[PDB]
Amino acid sequence: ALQLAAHSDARSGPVGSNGGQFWSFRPVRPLNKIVLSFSGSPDQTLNLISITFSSNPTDIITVGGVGPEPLTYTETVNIDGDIIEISGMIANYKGYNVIRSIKFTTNKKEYGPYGANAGTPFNIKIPDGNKIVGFFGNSGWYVDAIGAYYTAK
Amino acid sequence: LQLAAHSDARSGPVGSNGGQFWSFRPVRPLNKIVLSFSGSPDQTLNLISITFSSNPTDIITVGGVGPEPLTYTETVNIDGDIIEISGMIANYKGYNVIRSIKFTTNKKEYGPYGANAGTPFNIKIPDGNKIVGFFGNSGWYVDAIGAYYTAK
Amino acid sequence: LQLAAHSDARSGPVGSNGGQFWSFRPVRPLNKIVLSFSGSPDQTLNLISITFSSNPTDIITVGGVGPEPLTYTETVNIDGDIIEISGMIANYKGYNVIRSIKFTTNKKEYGPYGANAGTPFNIKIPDGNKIVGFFGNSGWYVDAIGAYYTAK
Amino acid sequence: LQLAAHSDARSGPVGSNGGQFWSFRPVRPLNKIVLSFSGSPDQTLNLISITFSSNPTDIITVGGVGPEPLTYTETVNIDGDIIEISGMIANYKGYNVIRSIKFTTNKKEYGPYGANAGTPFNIKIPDGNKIVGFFGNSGWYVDAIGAYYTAK
Ligand SMILES: CO[C@H]1O[C@H](CO)[C@@H](O)[C@H](O)[C@H]1O
Ligand SMILES: CO[C@H]1O[C@H](CO)[C@@H](O)[C@H](O)[C@H]1O
Ligand SMILES: CO[C@H]1O[C@H](CO)[C@@H](O)[C@H](O)[C@H]1O
Ligand SMILES: CO[C@H]1O[C@H](CO)[C@@H](O)[C@H](O)[C@H]1O
């Protein structure tokens, strides 16, 4: 059959630091839900352990959180519209530089930041007219690094 | 400190350009793969979509966004590390898509599943490595597929 | 001031595995491509290597690391933006490699150059975009090739 | 043998987004790197562009597309397998870019070359591998850098 070259989306990032495992999630349908899991409490200090990305039913993935630290606080984000940017803070946690906070911005609403808004700032932006259709990164016990896939609207 | 994070090497993709690019590289091993078809096992099976998953949770389905009703499904319980995939590419309703697929682990072979006809593809990786994810293009069907690999 | 760095979308590769992965995406436009072959134009041409270059200095050569002497070269001076690449894939001395290649801009066509016979390949990008670089696999010959692209 | 082609694993990028995405992964070893600066060796050197090469043919220059006059260059003749890169990121004329860089091979070290200040970066690869190419973002300066690596 004709070998019609298949395409791979452009990427922005990753930011943060190297983690034991590389991960990627780029669903065919829009990303519509994000669940961030923390240890600690919102009245004290939040420690981001894992992130869960989902697209409609069935499509879902959880990165970070393979360690023993119990989860004690979850934040559910229901995305309305197209994500165009994500930002947050990077800092050391129990020995590793990881994503400590995170904020999702769509062309309609703003969600976050969530977590410990302290440390080194990061900002994943894409050219005007594009949208984020996925995420990839490095992770282990925690979320070491994050990057995004993007394509024209 | 900005300590460069890594991205696994890739093999492929093979097949044809499709409407959407897709990627699924879970942090835990792949353990289950569900293939959905139209047609029938007694005659000819038409591969429509593929579902990849890793326990617990972690799942994705590619292809199958169209109106064609599904009529059959085959669940592959992955035993071991996937070291290669192969199959056939043939035309279907106007497009060239993945028509058959076989998963090979050091422990056993699964497939080929689907329709054994068309152009053969073969995704092999260097010895000592294992496939830890898949990526590709898809729309109504599975247009293209490729794999992520790393040291075992 | 401190945003994450970007990587261009990719289309491909087409062809088959080769010993070395190669990549060339210069900061300035691809304006000269030199194709090196064995054999002769009055007979059949065997593509051995390809040289990509961007104005002075920026240059790379893939394939052709074998001992087979080159007896024919085709120089292509690209006028505008390359939006498509096509050609043929076929066996050469026990290897499936790029045998033929044609470059297409918005107003001109260059080639095909080489041996027009085998399995056809085509690298197309979404309208409004342009090819800004290439990647693939190579060794003695040119095993596979893919393109980097971005908006005009 | 019709096997899918492979793409080397990646580490990075580090630094900040830049106008152009760039990539250079030659088939043969990288045996020479030239760093071009403005300023002076006695005071502060400002990294403006980096030139990578393998043999007198494969060469690429990233950064330096601006009118800023160069005033110093440093040539690094790599002896062994480059297994690590490091340096500093800092502001220069309103841009966060690579200001310092150091190359480490399986034999010796080269650098740090450039200005001391800013955020450190480190591109390290798993044991047993080596850097076979580099990619990143650039404009008037070198905005971001990453490495392609494979088993040595
Ligand atoms: C506790 O160590 C584990 O978790 C951290 C954090 O996510 C990873 O960086 C590391 O590679 C993994 O082995
Ligand atoms: C029927 O057309 C749809 O499905 C095919 C196949 O999977 C895709 O290639 C195409 O882009 C999409 O629009
Ligand atoms: C002759 O063998 C060499 O050249 C061929 C073709 O380029 C490559 O596929 C192969 O890996 C390399 O070792
Ligand atoms: C002067 O501006 C130019 O050079 C800087 C630094 O290289 C790039 O970041 C920017 O995108 C490009 O347009």
Q: What is the DSSP string of C58-98?
A: EEEEEE--SSPPP-EEEEEE--S---EEEEEEEESSS-EEE
Distances D1 to A4, A67, B115, D5 between C-alpha atoms, Å: 19, 43, 22, 12
Does the annotation flag B142 for ligand binding? yes
> Does a cis peptide bond (omega within 30 degrees of 0) precede residue C13?
yes
Report how far residue A62's alpha carbon sits from residue A9's, in angstroms, rounded to the nearest whole number: 21
Dihedral (CA of D115, D117, D120, D121) sign:
negative
Does the annotation flag C143 for ligand binding? yes
CA atoms within 13 A on the CB side of C89: 27
List the Cα angle D60/D66/D67 in 5-degree steps.
Answer: 125
Burial of D107 (0-12, 13-18, 19+ CB in 10 A): exposed
Residues near A31 by beta carbon (within 8 Å), at least 6 away in sequence? A53, A54, A55, A79, A83, A132, A133, A134, A135
Q: Are D37 and D72 in contact (CB under 8 A)?
A: yes
Report how far residue D67's alpha carbon sits from residue D90's, in angstroms, rounded to the nearest whole number: 20
Tell me, yes or no, if D77 comes closer than 8 A to chain C by beta carbon: no
Q: Are B14 and B146 in contact (CB under 8 A)?
A: yes
Q: Residue A82's closest CA among A54, A60, A104, A101?
A: A104
Distances B81 to A44, A140, B32 between C-alpha atoms, Å: 43, 20, 12
Question: How many C-beta atoms lie closer than 10 Å to residue C95's C-beta?
Answer: 17
Tell me, yes or no, if B28 comes closer than 8 A to chain A by beta carbon: yes
Q: Are D11 and B131 in contact (CB under 8 A)?
A: no
| DSSP designation for A25 | E
Q: Residue D131's closest CA among D117, D112, D115, D146?
A: D146
Cα-Cα end-to-end distance for chain C: 24
Report how far residue A39's alpha carbon sits from residue B63's, in angstroms, rounded to the nearest whole number: 37
Sheet with B119-124: list strands edge to edge.
Answer: B109-114, B95-105, B82-92, B119-124
Q: Considering CB atoms only, which of A24, A97, A145 is closest to B25?
A: A24
Burial of C33 (0-12, 13-18, 19+ CB in 10 A): buried
Is D2 close to B122, i.e. CB distance below 8 A?
yes
User: In units of Å, what resolution does this entry have?
Assistant: 2.1
User: Which domain, by its residues, includes B62?
Assistant: 1-152
Alpha helices in chain B (DSSP H): none
| DSSP designation for A44 | S
Tell me, yes or no, if D124 comes closer than 8 A to chain A by beta carbon: yes
Question: How many C-beta atoms lie closer than 10 Å to residue A145's C-beta?
Answer: 27
Question: How many C-beta atoms lie closer than 10 Å to residue C151's C-beta?
Answer: 15
Report how far residue D95's alpha carbon sits from residue B95's, in angstroms, rounded to the nearest whole number: 47
> Does a cis peptide bond (omega within 30 degrees of 0) precede residue B126?
no
Residues near A68 by beta carbon (within 8 Å), at least 6 away in sequence? none
Report how far residue D135's alpha carbon sits from residue D146's, in angstroms, rounded to the nearest whole number: 5
Residue type, D112: P
Report how far residue B97's alpha carbon sits from residue B142's, in angstroms, rounded to the nearest whole number: 6
Dihedral (CA of D35, D102, D131, C65) sign:
positive
Distances B14 to C9, D35, D108 between C-alpha atoms, Å: 17, 39, 41
**Chain centre distance of CA D45:** 16
Is B4 close to D15, i.e. CB distance below 8 A?
no
Report how far residue B73's alpha carbon sits from residue B75's, in angstroms, rounded to the nearest whole number: 7
Distances C92 to C38, C66, C123, D3 between C-alpha atoms, Å: 11, 13, 22, 15
What does the block give as tokens for A60?
A: 């879902």
- Find out whether the beta carbon of A114 lies less than 6 Å from any atom of ligand 1: no
Q: Regarding beta strands B2-3 and D119-124, do their DSSP bridges make them parallel or antiparallel, or are they unpaired?
A: parallel
Q: Residue D50's closest CA among D22, D27, D28?
A: D22
Q: Residue C54's closest CA among C26, C82, C84, C18?
A: C26
Q: How many domains does chain A fold into?
A: 1
- For A95, the enclosing helix (H) or strand (E) is none
Is C25 close to D23, i.e. CB distance below 8 A?
yes
Biggest distance spanned by C-alpha atoms of chain D:
58
Q: Residue C40's closest CA among C67, C19, C84, C70?
A: C70
Distances B32 to A136, B82, B100, C115 between C-alpha atoms, Å: 21, 11, 17, 44
Report how far residue D75's alpha carbon sits from residue D52's, in angstroms, rounded to the nearest whole number: 10
**CATH classification of the domain holding C144:** 2.100.10.30
Does the annotation flag B22 for ligand binding? no
What does the block give as tokens for D55?
A: 């043999």
Query: Residue A105: beta bridge partners?
Result: A85, A110
Q: Residue A129's closest CA among D16, D17, C151, D143?
A: C151
Residues of A in contact with C3 (CB under 8 A): 123-125
Residue with tokens 């091993």: B29
Query: Residue A11: beta bridge partners?
Result: A149, C7
Q: Are A4 and B16 in contact (CB under 8 A)?
A: yes
Report how far residue C95's alpha carbon sits from residue D107's, in angstroms, rounded to the nearest whole number: 36
Residues near A44 by beta carbon (within 8 Å), at least 6 away in sequence? none
What are residue C56's phi and psi, to 5 degrees? -70, 155
Q: Where are the beta strands (DSSP E) in chain C?
A: 6-7, 9-15, 20-25, 32-39, 45-54, 58-63, 72-77, 84-91, 96-104, 109-114, 119-124, 129-138, 142-151
Residues near A9 by beta carbon (within 8 Å), at least 6 away in sequence? A26, A133, A134, A149, A150, A151, B21, C9
**Chain centre distance of CA A44:** 23
Query: Residue C87: beta bridge partners?
Result: C101, C121
What would you report as the CA-atom Rg of chain D, rounded to the nearest whole angstrom? 15
Q: Residue A144's closest CA among A53, A59, A73, A48?
A: A48
Tell me, yes or no, if A18 comes closer than 8 A to chain D by beta carbon: yes
Dihedral (CA of B82, B84, B88, B91) sign:
positive
